[PDB]
From a paper:
Peptides derived from the HIV-1 gp41 CHR are potent HIV fusion inhibitors, which specifically interact with the viral gp41 NHR to form heterogeneous 6-HB to prevent fusogenic gp41 core formation. Our previous studies have shown that AP1 and AP2, artificial peptides with non-native protein sequences, could form coiled-coil structure to interact with gp41 NHR and inhibit HIV-1 Env-mediated cell-cell fusion. To elucidate the molecular determinants of these artificial peptides, we successfully solved all three complex structures of AP1/AP2/AP3 peptides binding with gp41 NHR.
Interestingly, the crystals of three different inhibitors belong to three distinctive space groups: P21 for N36-L6-AP1, R32 for N36-L6-AP2, and P63 for N45/AP3. Moreover, the hydrophobic residue M629 in CHR was replaced with a hydrophilic residue E44 in AP2 and AP3. However, in the corresponding sequence (from W43 to K76) of AP1 and AP2, a hydrogen bond was established between S57 (corresponding to I642 in CHR) and Q18 (corresponding to Q565 in NHR) in N36-L6-AP1, N36-L6-AP2 and N45/AP3. However, in N36-L6-AP1, N36-L6-AP2 and N45/AP3, I54 (corresponding to T639 in CHR) can strongly bind to L20 and L21 through fully hydrophobic side chain interactions.
Author numbering:
A (entry chain A), B (entry chain A), C (entry chain A): 3 to 72
The structure:
């Protein structure tokens, strides 16, 4: 349960980076295809950014707790 | 390992909401760009919906188990 | 904490499959809409593929550790 939580965290991290990459691709599609590009997507961007930040801190939080144990 | 599992769950949740937001954006792209909009995407929608539901229940399940401990 | 880690893993898995499905949808959008289709996306594809593989192994790793306990 020691190395278990560590791999859970690492999996969560990878999924995080995945998610960020899909966000980038979807943004590129808006930019390339839509006549107004990323215009009007501002609020969707803010919601995405808020959850990425929240995710990033929790990750950091988990990392800290883990090594406080170690 | 107490507050560890709780932050893992919360991270999983955030990623969940992220994922839902990317799904929304991809659906908007289908709707706005494709001549037939979201037409023909029905099965992809069903697969997405099935995994979101599965995810949501597991989250709930984790939450319950956690506080049954508390 | 026994059945807790197991549901965390399963949630992570579901999110994984979700993520793969969004990747598929974004690839279909590139293919259908862009004049050059998926052309020029090769590096983005490689980054995605690298993180999916990493994710898949960690999942497998978690599964193994879990039942080594059981
Ligand atoms: Mg347009
Ligand atoms: Mg069309
Ligand atoms: Mg074009």
């Amino acid at each position: 349960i020691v190395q278990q939580q560590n791999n859970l965290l690492r999996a969560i991290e990878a999924q995080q980076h995945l998610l960020q990459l899909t966000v980038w691709g979807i943004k590129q599609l808006q930019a390339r295809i839509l006549s107004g590009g990323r215009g009007g997507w501002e609020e969707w961007d803010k919601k995405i950014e808020e959850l990425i930040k929240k995710s990033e801190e929790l990750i950091k939080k988990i990392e800290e707790q883990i090594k406080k144990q170690e």
